[PDB]
């Protein structure tokens, strides 16, 4: 009976804790409530094929790790000193009901963008199954 879409952002000037789940606290759109800004996790309601993608701004080293149901799927790292860059990553996943997806950082955890540079995490259902 349904669709699935979200874009959430991190609105804080403080970076995540090292080796932790990245919480996106602000919503740009999240009609089904699949992303939970309280836990930082997306949970599958409608099973099928999803795209997940993020673009995270940072002024020191940052690796982003995408987890699915407790397994690291992909990791992408950008190194910088002082100046600002965007770390991006993404993947397509066929999920079953109740599966959780989330982003984390490792020992490289910086998400402090300069003024005007934000961090965003999006996902959407492409093919119901």
């Amino acid at each position: 009976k349904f669709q699935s879409v979200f874009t959430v952002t991190r609105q804080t000037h403080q970076p995540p804790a090292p080796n932790s789940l990245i919480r996106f606290n602000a919503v740009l759109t999240n009609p089904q409530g699949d992303y939970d800004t309280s836990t930082g996790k997306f949970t599958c309601k409608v099973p099928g094929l999803y795209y997940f993608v993020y673009h995270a701004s940072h002024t020191a080293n940052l690796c982003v790790l995408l987890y699915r149901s407790g397994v690291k799927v992909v990791t992408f790292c950008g190194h910088t000193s002082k100046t600002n860059q965007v770390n991006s990553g993404g993947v397509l996943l066929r999920l079953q009901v109740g599966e959780e997806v989330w982003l984390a950082v490792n020992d490289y955890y910086d998400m402090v963008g300069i003024q005007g540079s934000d961090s965003v995490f999006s996902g959407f259902l492409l093919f119901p199954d």
């Binding site: 094929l49 795209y51 993608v53 690796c63 690291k72 799927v73 992909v74 990791t75 992408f76 790292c77 950008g78 190194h79 910088t80 860059q85 770390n87 991006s88 990553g89 993404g90 993947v91 397509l92 996943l93 066929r94 490792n106 492409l126 093919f127 199954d129």
Partner: protein, 132 residues
């Protein structure tokens, strides 16, 4: 009912030559089996609009060509992203209208710093938008 999507990473630990097809050997997702991990090429069976995208980890200068075409490939765009004595992640994307038999893939250049490993992955993905 055309559900076509693929995501494959590159774990191949071997330098790339100019004009060589960049193979993404490890399949995460391959609905409809239109991606070939053996070649690194997507082959269209269902004509339509597709989106392709990639994220490439790198330790130096990288330029990749996004290739389209049936038997003879043609470059659509080239994405370059440089890095000096550091580590980077770069990305590119394209919505393409595909005809039957057309392949899409990424092709290396002289600028070939690309990594494929756990904790610094390089991935190539694509999916059908609308068939027709």
């Amino acid at each position: 009912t055309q559900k076509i999507a693929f995501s494959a990473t590159r774990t191949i630990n071997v330098p790339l030559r100019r004009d060589q097809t960049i193979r993404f050997d490890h399949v995460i997702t391959n609905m409809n089996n239109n991606y070939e991990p053996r070649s690194g090429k997507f082959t269209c069976k269902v004509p339509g609009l597709y989106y392709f995208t990639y994220h490439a980890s790198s330790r130096g200068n990288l330029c990749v060509n996004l290739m389209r075409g049936r038997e003879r490939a043609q470059k659509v765009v080239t994405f370059c992203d440089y890095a000096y004595n550091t580590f980077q992640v770069t990305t590119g994307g394209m919505v393409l209208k595909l005809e039957q038999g057309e392949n899409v893939f990424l092709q290396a250049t002289d600028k070939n710093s690309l990594l494929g490993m756990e904790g610094a992955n390089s991935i190539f993905s694509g999916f059908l938008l609308f068939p027709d």
